[PDB]
A paper describes a structure:
To experimentally validate our findings, we performed cryo-EM experiments, where we refined a glyco-diosgenin (GDN) detergent-solubilised, symmetric SC to an overall resolution of 2.3 Å, and a local resolution of 2.0 Å for the core parts, and another dataset of the same state, to 2.8 Å global resolution (to 2.5 Å at the core), enabling us to independently determine the position of functionally central and previously unresolved water molecules that are key for the proton transfer reactions. The refined structures revealed a symmetric SC, comprising 22 main subunits, including LpqE. We focus here on the higher resolution dataset, which contains more details, while the other dataset shows overall similar results and serves as an independent validation of our model. The data allowed us to assign densities of 614 water molecules (in the 2.3 Å map, and 249 in the 2.8 Å map), many of which are located around key functional regions in Complexes III and IV. The two datasets are consistent with each other, resolving water molecules at the same positions in several sites, but with significantly higher statistical certainty in the 2.3 Å resolution map. Importantly, the higher (2.3 Å) resolution map allowed us to further assign functionally central water molecules near CuB, as well as in the D- and K-channels. These experimentally determined water positions are in excellent overall agreement with the hydration dynamics independently predicted by our MD simulations, supporting the complementarity between the approaches, but not observed in the 2.8 Å map due to possible averaging effects. In our cryo-EM data, we observe densities for menaquinone only in the Qo1b and Qo2 sites, consistent with previous studies, although their functional roles for catalysis have remained unclear. On the Complex III side of the SC, we observe ten menaquinone molecules (five per monomer) at five different positions.
Residue numbers in the entry:
A (entry chain R): 10 to 561
B (entry chain P): 1 to 13, 28 to 100
C (entry chain V): 14 to 157
D (entry chain Q): 27 to 114
E (entry chain T): 1 to 139
F (entry chain U): 2 to 56, 69 to 79
G (entry chain N): 391 to 538
H (entry chain S): 20 to 203
The structure:
Amino acid sequence: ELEARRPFPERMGPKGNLIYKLITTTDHKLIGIMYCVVCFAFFLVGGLMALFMRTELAMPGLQFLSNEQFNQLFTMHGTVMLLFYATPIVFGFANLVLPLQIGAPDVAFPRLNALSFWLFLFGALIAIAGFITPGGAADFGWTAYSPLTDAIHSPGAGGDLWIMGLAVGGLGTILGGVNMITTVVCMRAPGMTMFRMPIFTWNILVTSILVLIAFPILTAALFGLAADRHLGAHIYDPANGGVLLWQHLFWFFGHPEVYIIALPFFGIVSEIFPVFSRKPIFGYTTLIYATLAIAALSVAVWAHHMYATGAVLLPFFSFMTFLIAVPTGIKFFNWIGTMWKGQLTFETPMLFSVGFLITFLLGGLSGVLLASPPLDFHVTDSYFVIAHFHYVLFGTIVFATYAGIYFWFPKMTGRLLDERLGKLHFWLTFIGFHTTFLVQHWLGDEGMPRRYADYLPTDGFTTLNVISTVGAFILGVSMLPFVWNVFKSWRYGEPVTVDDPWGYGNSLEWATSCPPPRHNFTELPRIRSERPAFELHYPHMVERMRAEAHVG
Amino acid sequence: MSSTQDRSQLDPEVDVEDVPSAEWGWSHMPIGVMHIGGLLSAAFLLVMMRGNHVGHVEDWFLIGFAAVIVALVGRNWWLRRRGWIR
Amino acid sequence: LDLPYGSALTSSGRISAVTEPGELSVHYPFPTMDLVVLDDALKYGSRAAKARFAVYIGPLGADTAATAREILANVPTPENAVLLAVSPDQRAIEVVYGADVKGRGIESAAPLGVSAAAASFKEGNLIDGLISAVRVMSAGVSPA
Amino acid sequence: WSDALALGWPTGITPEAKLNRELWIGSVIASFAVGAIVWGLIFWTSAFHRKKATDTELPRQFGYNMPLELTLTVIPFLIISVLFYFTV
Amino acid sequence: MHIEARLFEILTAFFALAAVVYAVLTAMFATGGVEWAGTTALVLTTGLTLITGTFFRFVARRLDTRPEDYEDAEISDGAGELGFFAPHSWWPILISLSFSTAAVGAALWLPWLIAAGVAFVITSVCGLVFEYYWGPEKH
Amino acid sequence: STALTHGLIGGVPLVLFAVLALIFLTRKGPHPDTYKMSDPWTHAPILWAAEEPREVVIGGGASGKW
Amino acid sequence: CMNDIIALKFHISLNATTWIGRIGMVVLPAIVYFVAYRWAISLQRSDREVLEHGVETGIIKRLPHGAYVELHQPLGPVDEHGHPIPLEYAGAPLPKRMNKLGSGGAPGTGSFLFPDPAVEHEALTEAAHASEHKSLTALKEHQDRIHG
Amino acid sequence: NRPNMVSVGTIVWLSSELMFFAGLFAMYFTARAQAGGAWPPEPTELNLALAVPVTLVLIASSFTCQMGVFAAERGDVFGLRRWYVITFLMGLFFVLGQGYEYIHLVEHGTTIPGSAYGSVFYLATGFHGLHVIGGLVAFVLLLARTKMSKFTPAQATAAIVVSYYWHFVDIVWIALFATIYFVR
Ligand code: HEA
Ligand code: HEA
Ligand SMILES: CCCCCCCCCCCCCCCC(=O)O[C@H](COC(=O)CCCCCCC[C@@H](C)CCCCCCCCC)COP(=O)(O)O[C@H]1[C@H](O)[C@H](O)[C@@H](O)[C@@H](O)[C@@H]1O
Ligand SMILES: CCCCCCCCCCCCCC(=O)O[C@H](COC(=O)CCCCCCCCCCC)COP(=O)(O)O
Ligand SMILES: [Ca+2]
Ligand SMILES: [Cu+2]
Ligand SMILES: [Mg+2]
């Protein structure tokens, strides 16, 4: 019964089978693989700017930069990292496993699914191409307060390209959001009821719903601003009450935006915990309600970004902001209960997902303090807030993203990433991050304001800047082993020839091959619970799963 | 067949595993033309630094591009020699 | 029949196997790069001679190493194929080919194809001998 | 001792500043407590609950606990309520 | 499809409550007026969910239980005929390029570029929509 | 000092590296060690064959000894 | 040649355009060569997929055991198992959409706003179909007589 | 026995397009608050004798659209093809009437850079007017496709979704008219 097999799998394709299949494709699996490659390419560009502005922040004198360059530099870092890396990388993970998770062969509209990626890429390019101009790119922050973006102040051409690129990106985002709702609602397998799908799918569905509300109101505001800058349209005049109109319009978008790039990465950790813990996810019904409550609450909390303005109803936005901190603790406790009383092995996915917990807790703790107007009266618009949103944001889209990559690399490629090369990366990242961002709280507390190009020698805060710069260079060098690992192990990696290399996988993507076929499936199991693949592989556990499920 | 398509039969007057239609036209450029071309292009990029310009940003751009070209050529040559590619 | 822990027969007749988190699936006793070197040699040799090449490493020795004739009946298209069987437990070298490579130079190829393997088998080298034998054999079989 | 707990705020020069400093220092303690009692929980299970040498069967497959989930949504609610009161 | 419909009206109820609360609480004891910017957004956020909820309710009451909506259904119940999906197309990238051209035209205020972009967009959309409907050539 | 800062920024990263690279990259992986011919062959039978050309009666043979 | 007009209308340095062109005139051709070569080979490989499997109709089947397949339309004779017999390349274009093969009739004989009597439509459809048969048959007969 | 996914796709998209107009409504209500007396300033004067008939034509367009949809469900390709042409003509009438009102208003001193009221008026009514032209393009694009192949259920689905879009358009206009010409 000997079977003939090759000594080693094929490394690469036969001199051209990708170039034409890159421009005509409608495969969701292919589009996802070409959705992160570009995201990680933009990550480096966004981070190089941070390295520049961190190097020109360690000594009191202006050594090699100017004011204008520094302004453009932090503005473009801020925009590229948020809108050209994170918001997109959300949708990369969607059309990579969601059809596999629901048991569908395809997305609802494939030929529309293709358009979103190209809109993303070209919008991003138009926005970034502001550096070719003799003037430079946008130099007014990602927030874009008015009147500073009026024809009078910031009359350059970089700002115009910024405005007109964000709109083209936002159209792709909306069109991508339209597709996932349809796919979830009307593409499911028989027996896959709404309350039987995994957590990731719920998160993506609610995220899409949130996108549909957040983005159009931003595009409208951008059109309004372009009207002022090109026609002299008297929309955001200070005399006309437009200084606060624009801020309301922007912050109706801004905070739902930061909750667009949070829940999907909650889903990833919620999918990773049960696999490596050899135990079911503790609380399935309640996590859905937590997601729904967090999403619903994050619409009526938008003026907590506007405290120093002294022009908002303070009680309204403080109480609700306190309330949006309740279900997050529920999620934390559910994760802890999931990883409670089970065999844990701590491979790379679990290590990253645990780093996520440790970082995000302090991020959220700092975030709650900002919600009280008395404390934000002293803290706002200083490096304390920068310390805050570089923990709550660095856990979801860095640690959880890497966890997802290490988790789903074999399922998408058929190779295993190295282990001795994936732990050095994690430890470098962790040490570098805590070295560079911990002292920013103190900096903001002593009275160092944000968006300052330089400072005076007799200011007190000099050594903390040196520590931050050292940590930032460690965090910048940390990424070499990861890229090396991906480059090396894509074609010379260890071959996985099973249906699941992680053993106790629960979702339906582990009930197929590595990688899956063109239409994702050659068979389907019988859908009974939220762990179909586990019951496929372990039929002797059904009686032990439905009897031990409840603790009293 | 109930289809409209008409099959064509034709007879006019590197192997087929790499280039499927290898016997229908010119489908091989010898290696060594491309390596020497790359090196010569790098030399030209390097030599254009002699002129009347007074800036130095352009010089660094030229150096970077030449370095990239040389690195690509070197990598290809090394891998071809060592036996990992054909 | 027999299914390991984590394996299950599906509705299509295909199996779904499982491996432990920190474990592999293939676990050959040879380095990866050596496997690559053997594989591409086996691939380009086979393509040139238009005859499938195979390698066997296992206990074929029962009756003067004559079950190789039965192992050759497992490769795809057994008629147009060549085999090389090696027994390290018994120091046995065997070559057997199907009835389509006749008259293409394989008659004059096996005698030195086995010598090439044996020459390197006089050292502690095993994976080197297979590639050497394949290289010396595939360069003497005419495509027709 | 208050220096290492105010994370480097300046001391006030007006009564309102002193009252704000009092509120802030009182809140930092209330946030380190809930951080410690969760870091401890994460550390506890990451050092004791592991795959031991003795390869036993899969552990207890429990996934629901209604009383603990019900008594857990109420405990932070009181904390945020008191914080809201003091904030006001 | 009752779960889908219920998930939307839950959000509708919450959004309506939030909008009504916000509108009144700003009319009384809040400087200025009603804070028209925030009130406007929340009364249309509710409408967003209301439209979808109503549509889903109608669809759910029209059609009966599907294989997806049945707790204990078999795989063999779903066997049949899915529908149509596009295997491949190179038109999306052309649409994106056309829109990019129009956007670059609008950014630098070059009306000729804007006009060219609009023409390109129309042509590309025409190409996309008519792809699987063109008949054979008449000769 | 303009001497300590420049040396420290570019010095610490390269020292933290190559100390974390000595305690991770200097251990044995899951790839099994190479088989020597001085020991009995203990492994399942191996049958390798090419996939070219793509898509019973046997009339030859040879032998050797080592 | 028009680097002074591009530098005015589009906001870019006039000094920068010269260097862009100077560096480009040695770099861009090489990139174009590589991309063109790969693209041509990929278009070749696109033709070998349809001669072997057939035209993808864009329809998914969902078999009883829960398998997803796509229906293919063979361009020639079929095997006893239903898989098409492979065809040879003859340097000629191949169809890739089912609508170009006649998977779609005329909406109906008539004006843009009013239809014609049914009999006319039936007769015209019959004539057109028969004419298509005759043309194809003539070409096939000529091609068969040539290669004897 | 299944939901129409091309129908659900259009409805979900139409929900998001309603939040686009939220911005414009917010701008209008914000600029209205800082009126400083009479909200329509001295130079401007709205003429109800031209905005009413055009609104009535736009309202009547929906009836013809629905008649076309009803004809589409039966298989009448000519019935579908007949109502959509008159719908297109009425939409074109709407656009030309709106343009005429614009020309009249500009000559009397109400412009975009002239005032804040001009700004909000033109922005709100010009973003709406773009959608109507898009709808007309959709009509012509769909009517061209009904001649390419035989009339199948997919064609009916396309007609229905286009009708959905048109209905949304005129419902938005009714709101705009009520909030601009009456609630001044
Ligand atoms: C996902 C979101 C995200 C991520 C990941 C980061 C990542 C980092 N950020 Fe953050 N940042 C923001 C979101 C993010 N940031 C936002 C929203 C602002 C607001 C500012 C504003 O108002 O505009 C901000 C602003 C901000 C500031 C405040 C600046 C100021 O206000 O003056 C600082 C301070 O140091 C900072 C530092 C960093 C550092 C050191 C990293 C490190 O993570 C990154 C280091 C990584 C790299 C450097 C990659 C390495 C690159 C290479 C090794 C070379 C490769 C070369 C090529 C490809 C050509 N960023
Ligand atoms: C990116 C992701 C992200 C996430 C998830 C959040 C989450 C939160 N954010 Fe936001 N925020 C940003 C991104 C994010 N934020 C960004 C980018 C900015 C700056 C934009 C700019 O101005 O440039 C910002 C700014 C910002 C401000 C304005 C600050 C200022 O400008 O001065 C405020 C104020 O209310 C705020 C509050 C919160 C709160 C209360 C949460 C809550 O979601 C977090 C709650 C988490 C926890 C509570 C921890 C877990 C809970 C438990 C373990 C139970 C414990 C119970 C109690 C303590 C009672 N953040
Ligand atoms: C046709 C495509 C060709 C493809 C080939 C690509 C090759 C690109 C090579 C890169 C060119 C580098 C140009 C450098 C040569 C140079 O001189 O550049 C300087 C300023 O560097 C810059 O900006 C660098 C700009 C980089 C441009 C990158 C080009 C990529 C674009 C062109 C690709 C997009 C293609 C178009 C897309 C359209 C189709 C879409 C697909 C200007 O000097 P200057 O201005 O005098 O600076 C003075 C100080 O010195 C002094 O202190 C003082 O401060 C002042 O006196 C100051 O003036
Ligand atoms: C992505 C593609 C976007 C392209 C948009 C094209 C729109 C450009 C139209 C230019 C209008 C100039 C009219 C003007 O200033 O004349 C003024 C009067 O304009 C009007 O009242 C008619 C304007 C038509 C309404 C259209 C609104 C659309 C809003 C678009 C916001 C960007 C006269 O200015 P003046 O007093 O002479 O200084
Ligand atoms: Ca400095
Ligand atoms: Cu906020
Ligand atoms: Mg501020």
